[PDB]
Amino acid sequence: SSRDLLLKAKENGRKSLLEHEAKYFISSYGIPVTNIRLAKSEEEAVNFSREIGFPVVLKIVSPQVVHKSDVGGVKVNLRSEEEVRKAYREIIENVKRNVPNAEIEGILVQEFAPPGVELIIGLLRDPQFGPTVMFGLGGVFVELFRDVSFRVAPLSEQDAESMIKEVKAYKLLTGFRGMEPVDIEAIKDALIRAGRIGVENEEIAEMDLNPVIAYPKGIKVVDARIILR
């Protein structure tokens, strides 16, 4: 059961899931995620990259590192078998100097998501209303303008559709200069399933699917944080 991930994390006194764990858990509910494998050697990294398909993304996986970018932990758009291999050593060595005593669970090998319309799908717990789903457009639209919609879970199709249509940046989904319309049904589906996650899993304090990239067909969660209670 996917709940084994939540149970394990709690048994080891962790307040959050690691990146790969969060994505496994997300995936098991039917929310599409970046294809991922946890590498335990630079050699596994090349193998998994060949499985997943180039280009790949390499991230360090560790409780001690929560900002991968500031510690040299993330290498993006690695196109070949050994672009990743040098990158592997750059991460692994970079981490020692900036935080030398960090636990390495491994280095996460990831699908390089192409560009699209970035989304945020949030889940929080409101004292009055319990698990509440949050939606908004990525980048400055949520972070700066706070253009966001809420629905209390469980979400009906009506709730999912209406909350998408609600945001001020909604037109970014229906086509504009240099960008085709994106799969709104796919977004609605992710919203509903996110609502289900909150309702069912009481030990999840909050969840943030950010960024989530929508394409003309389908969506893919690129990063996901899950906080436990």
């Binding site: 409101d126 004292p127 009055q128 209303f129 319990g130 509440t132 966001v148 919609s149 809420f150 629905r151 209390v152 009906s156 199709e157 009506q158 709730d159 209406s162 909350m163």
Partner: protein, 463 residues
């Protein structure tokens, strides 16, 4: 559990009544008698053998009768004792008027009150409330105005002062009331419980709620019950603290944080509730919703003798996401029978300022009888070629003769004669206002409820 005997008791006890007519308990006892409660009333006083012609008892448990409801207005430090006696007597509902609990920081006293009431199988309304009224039972258990106009609106208030004031204001605004409930601190019984009762209550057609906040863990229940209620009866919420600073002020008044502004709004949407930003909008909407069915379609007609009123109406409808389209040719041809050729038929239908009183009868009648018309807002600008009361009476006649029920709101502009005519209409249970914008706003509320209800239906679709 079930609030049937709360709203329709066989026996009410009043604890805190005395020979002093200024005491709250005395005020409540007076209201109960003057409003005409026909069940048993038992004044409860330590010494009085008799209050207001009724045999007084020193304890509720002494009453040789099953007391359904106990109205308690004794000081806070005496409440728990009274609760114990009521508990002994087998009282099912404790209406604790008395203030001085959580709102003043006395959380433990309040929770203890509820704990004590519950150990007897007794429910609590309040504390810190001005009481409750139920017109179908001729029951006025408040120290508010002794009377209200009879009708189908149930008004629930978390605010004591504004609540009891608005109770009087319903009379001025001609709002027919089935029930007033002061829920105050909501230590036990709250909006959800009352919504459950009013759902089932055939005397209640509309619910208006002044709401500052609901308890942690009550929201999901609130949405489930309210949405179901919304399928059959419109719910209007006057949300207090819809701004951050406002939320702070509300927290001061109630003694507990109300909650997320944004999430409350969303919950209201999911529940199909109409959120009013002001007393006036709430009352205007309640009137229309209480006196009209919801429109069965979007063919809304604006009929006006003044272009300016039409434009004000058009603008206001647009701000509420309601847009007018060309009226049916049949109706146009009908109106062309009497209006001048320079009349405008784009919707609003401008029958010109030359229009005498009977044109209002004829135009309203034609519109309402037309099978391709769903709703009508009638606008009138007073001129010397008309009389306000004549126009109003023409409208009344048209409504009657059409012999159907389509939603109608009226907006009349003018001097004291218009004020009297508007008063006259509202007393006919015809939603009338002294401005075109308010009339259209009222009509917009009918449409808003229609859309809200459709929202809920959709969200409840199987699969």
């Amino acid at each position: 559990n079930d609030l049937e005997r709360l709203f329709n008791p066989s026996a009410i006890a009043v604890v805190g009544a005395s020979k002093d007519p200024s005491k709250i308990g005395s005020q409540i006892l007076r209201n109960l008698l003057s409003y005409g409660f026909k069940g048993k009333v038992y004044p409860i006083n330590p010494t009085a053998d008799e209050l207001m012609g009724l045999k007084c008892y020193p304890k509720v448990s002494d009453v040789p009768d099953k007391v359904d409801v106990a109205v308690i207005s004794v000081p806070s430090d005496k409440v728990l004792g009274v609760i114990d006696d009521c508990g002994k007597a087998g009282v099912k509902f404790a209406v604790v008027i008395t203030s001085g609990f959580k709102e003043v920081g006395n959380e433990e006293l309040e929770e203890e009150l509820v704990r004590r009431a519950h150990s007897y199988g007794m429910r609590v309304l309040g504390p810190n409330i001005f009481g409750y009224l139920y017109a179908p039972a001729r029951l006025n258990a408040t120290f508010g105005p002794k009377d209200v106009l009879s009708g189908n609106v149930a008004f629930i208030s978390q605010s004591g002062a504004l609540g009891i004031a608005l109770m009087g204001y319903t009379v001025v605004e001609n709002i027919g009331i089935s029930s007033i409930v002061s829920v105050g601190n909501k230590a036990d019984l709250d909006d959800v419980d009352l919504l459950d009762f009013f759902d089932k209550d055939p005397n209640t057609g509309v619910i208006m709620i002044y709401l500052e906040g609901i308890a942690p863990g009550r929201g999901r229940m609130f949405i489930d019950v309210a949405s179901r209620v919304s399928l059959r009866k419109p719910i209007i919420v006057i949300k207090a603290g819809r701004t951050e600073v406002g939320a702070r002020a509300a927290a001061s008044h109630t003694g507990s944080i109300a909650g997320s502004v944004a999430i409350y709004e969303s919950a209201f949407k999911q529940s199909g509730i109409l959120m009013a930003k002001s007393v006036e909008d709430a009352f205007d909407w309640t009137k229309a919703l209480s006196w009209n069915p919801i429109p069965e379609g979007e063919r809304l007609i604006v009929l006006t003798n003044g272009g300016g009123a039409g434009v004000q109406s058009t603008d206001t409808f647009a701000d509420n996401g309601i847009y007018l389209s060309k009226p049916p040719e049949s109706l146009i041809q009908e109106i062309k029978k009497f209006v001048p050729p320079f009349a405008s038929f784009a919707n609003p239908i401008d029958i010109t300022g030359m229009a005498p009183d009977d044109w209002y009868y004829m135009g309203t009648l034609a519109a309402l009888k037309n099978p391709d018309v769903d709703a009508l807002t009638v606008l009138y600008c007073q001129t010397a070629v008309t009389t306000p009361i004549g126009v109003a009476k023409g409208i009344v006649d048209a409504i009657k003769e059409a012999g159907n029920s389509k939603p109608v709101t009226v907006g009349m502009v003018g001097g004291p004669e218009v004020a009297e005519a508007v008063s006259f209409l509202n007393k006919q249970r015809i939603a009338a206002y002294p401005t075109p914008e308010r009339a259209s706003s009222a009509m917009s509320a009918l449409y808003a409820y229609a859309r809200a209800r459709s929202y809920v239906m959709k969200s409840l679709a199987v699969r």
